[PDB]
Amino acid sequence: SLQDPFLNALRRERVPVSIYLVNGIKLQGQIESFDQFVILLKTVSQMVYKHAISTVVPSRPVSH
């Protein structure tokens, strides 16, 4: 109810984001797409499993 509109706003607005993983790695890029279980983060797109994500941090505020 909140997750989907937040991720969709980031995707639609092409906002650069930081995705912090539970193991301490920081990914950065734009959300190309997402589904129930994964986020596709744009050299290639990488498929990130949500279960591995701790936080998604927009580079700037977004309407949601």
Ligand X SMILES: O=c1ccn([C@@H]2O[C@H](COP(=O)(O)O)[C@@H](O)[C@H]2O)c(=O)[nH]1
Q: Is 49 in the site for ligand X (CB under 6 A)?
A: yes
**CA–CA distances in Å: residue 35 to residues 3, 22, 24, 40, 61:** 11, 19, 23, 9, 22
- The rounded distance, in Å, linking the Cα atoms of 50 and 57 is 14
Restricting to residues 14-43, name those near ligand X by CB under 6 A.
Answer: 36-37
Q: Judged by CB under 6 A, how many residues of this single chain contact ligand X?
A: 6
Considering beta carbons, is residue 6 or 14 the nearer one to its own copies?
Answer: 6
Report the residue from 3, 12, 14, 28 that binds its own copies according to the rule CB under 8 A: 3
